Design a protein around this ligand. Structure first.
Ligand SMILES: C[C@H]1Nc2c(cccc2C(=O)NCC(F)(F)CN2CCCc3ccccc32)NC1=O
Ligand SMILES: C[C@H]1Nc2c(cccc2C(=O)NCC(F)(F)CN2CCCc3ccccc32)NC1=O
Length: 114
């Protein structure tokens, strides 16, 4: 009912590492979206709450999650952002789907041990 930041961190970091380590599939997700650099300048018109892996890492590192479902919500926000923004035929969309499949596998037994 009260989760200490260092125990969320130690429980959840390996699930975040599972996403990061997927190469090339994590590469679009490792840093905040820079719409001008990426040549997707309308991104913030579509995606109102951006999220990426390095953001989620920083949140886990600084104790910003009071409970583990908040971490799951940020991961899924990142995925929902990609599935909204990109066409279903896009390699970014398909990479997002692969990362969600990996996440589902890794997070389910972790959320159960919590
Ligand atoms: C996964 C394994 N390690 C940790 C685990 C818990 C806490 C920290 C680490 C660790 O390793 N922290 C240093 C770092 F620097 F790795 C940050 N690191 C973590 C993965 C996400 C990521 C992405 C890019 C760069 C670093 C990084 N549990 C473990 O099971
Ligand atoms: C989250 C945001 N990302 C992009 C989106 C559209 C276009 C580009 C990106 C993006 O991030 N580019 C940086 C990259 F590092 F990913 C480059 N590169 C590495 C190898 C693997 C690969 C695969 C597909 C596209 C690029 C890419 N749509 C999005 O929603």
């Amino acid at each position: 009912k009260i989760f200490k930041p260092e125990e969320l961190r130690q429980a959840l970091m390996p699930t975040l590492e599972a996403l990061y380590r997927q190469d090339p599939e994590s590469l679009p997700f490792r840093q905040p979206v820079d719409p001008q650099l990426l040549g997707i300048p309308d991104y913030f018109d579509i995606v109102k709450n951006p999220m990426d892996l390095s953001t989620i890492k920083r949140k886990l590192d600084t104790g910003q999650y009071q409970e583990p479902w908040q971490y799951v919500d940020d991961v899924w926000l990142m995925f929902n952002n990609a599935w909204l923004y990109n066409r279903k035929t896009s390699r970014v969309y398909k990479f997002c789907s692969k990362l969600a499949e990996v996440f589902e596998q890794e997070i389910d037994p972790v959320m159960q041990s919590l």
